[PDB]
Design a protein around this ligand. Structure first.
Ligand SMILES: O=C(c1ccc(OCCN2CCCCC2)cc1)c1c(-c2ccc(O)cc2)sc2cc(O)ccc12
Ligand SMILES: O=C(c1ccc(OCCN2CCCCC2)cc1)c1c(-c2ccc(O)cc2)sc2cc(O)ccc12
Ligand SMILES: [Cl-]
Ligand SMILES: [Cl-]
Ligand SMILES: [Cl-]
Lengths: 237, 232
């Protein structure tokens, strides 16, 4: 696929924006807020699997590798979507069209304000850089494919590792091509590519801190089970 | 210029320290962790000297310098370890007198996971034939980027961004001087910056492993780093 075909496929695969089912009449307790966020994330996961299967090349990886990438990336992907939705809302996190939250609301849950501040800082960075939808979808696909923890290896794992490397190179090419099509100088192209890929290190950090936080709130039932992900991947929706 | 950035970073490389490993002592976990702790402690002093040689870093306020060092110090130690280890497949070269394999990492509770990640990162660097010029650029990028999204202030942030961009320019310049095509330049740049996200992951998991370990002086406290910045 040429660079435009990759971007076109990713744009067409964008998931829908879901609502939190927020009810203004309910007391807005910590448990109520976290319950809304939990059910929202759970409903977003199904759409994330559908999106992943449309990432060029993803379904040509082994089903094991598909699951493993989703297991590693799912919170990063939720977070970058949040940051994108919040770009045009300084100081706010737009979890859903009916759930806009600020720092002060995060303070009510121990450990949440620190992560809110990191998410807000990323949204500010995206706003300042005027991140384009074409760049966002490339970054989200890179997150999915780069998520696997470094690792005992078999011919199958090496085969999929090389495929993932080739896919990442093509998305890099597409990100650069979009910038060139948009008129950026060669010097601006490498600087902006570097700045955008460096933000992915911050999103990784936020995901790690977020996982720590979820485990301190819920003992178990925090990560999607392997069987759950495989079930959703195999569905012929 | 780009050549001046690369030459400056090469000249700023810290010395390779020894662990003081004594083969005659019983290699208890306490003895090993002690060697690694004191080694890291001694490396930190040289990391401060090096940081002040990263172009632009001296022009930042003490508060900003401390914040960046606070966020980056373990990643910087780890990328150094990975670099020293890429001539030793299957081993981590903490120091020339302390070369450890995966088995020796099992002695520490919860360390084999981090060990394997570091080993795999060293293999990645070996496969890519990472050059010293690229390595020093990556270390400088880690220093200027790890803490920039956790911070007048708006101008200070943009100032650090410009400092980063000058290192990116130098890293691409080196690749262009080495003969890579434009496509290979952008591909290799992306490959290296994506490895940095994994080194960030390793640092985060190492931090969780150090705090949970109850280790003494897990992090260089703010006041500690603040005082070391005034040594020179
Ligand atoms: O609040 C959440 C969140 C809540 C519950 C989650 O997991 C619920 C458990 N569920 C188990 C089955 C598999 C899917 C996860 C995940 C994110 C979100 C985030 C978060 C923010 C700060 C913080 O300290 C921790 C998390 S970021 C985010 C983006 C979304 O699109 C949805 C929820 C969220
Ligand atoms: O063993 C260590 C290590 C041990 C103690 C440390 O903290 C020491 C105390 N702290 C140091 C900074 C000043 C404040 C005191 C840091 C690294 C090293 C690493 C490590 C690996 C896996 C893991 O799970 C945790 C750490 S990586 C590394 C590279 C080095 O050059 C030296 C030590 C190391
Ligand atoms: Cl020494
Ligand atoms: Cl010394
Ligand atoms: Cl090269």
């Amino acid at each position: 696929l040429t660079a435009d075909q990759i971007i076109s496929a990713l744009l067409e695969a964008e998931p829908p924006i879901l609502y939190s089912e927020y009810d203004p009449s309910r007391p807005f307790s910590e448990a109520y807020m976290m319950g809304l966020l939990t059910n929202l994330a759970d409903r977003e996961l199904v759409h994330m699997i559908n999106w992943a299967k449309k990432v060029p090349g993803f379904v040509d990886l082994s089903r094991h590798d598909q699951v493993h990438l989703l297991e590693s990336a799912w919170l990063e992907i939720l977070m970058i979507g949040l940051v994108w939705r919040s770009m045009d809302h300084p100081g706010k996190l737009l979890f859903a069209p009916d759930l806009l939250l600020d720092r002060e609301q995060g303070k009510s849950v121990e450990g949440m304000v620190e992560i809110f501040d990191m998410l807000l800082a990323t949204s500010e960075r995206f706003r300042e850089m005027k991140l384009q939808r074409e760049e966002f979808v490339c970054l989200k696909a890179i997150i999915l494919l780069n998520s696997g923890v470094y690792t005992s290896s078999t011919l199958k794992s090496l085969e999929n590792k090389e495929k993932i490397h080739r896919m990442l190179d093509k998305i890099t090419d597409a990100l650069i091509w979009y910038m060139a099509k948009s008129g950026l100088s060669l010097q601006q192209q490498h600087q902006r590519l570097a700045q955008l890929l460096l933000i992915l290190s911050h999103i990784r950090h936020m995901s790690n801190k977020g996982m720590e936080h979820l485990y301190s709130m819920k003992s178990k039932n925090v990560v999607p089970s392997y069987d759950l992900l495989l079930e959703m991947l195999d569905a012929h929706r």
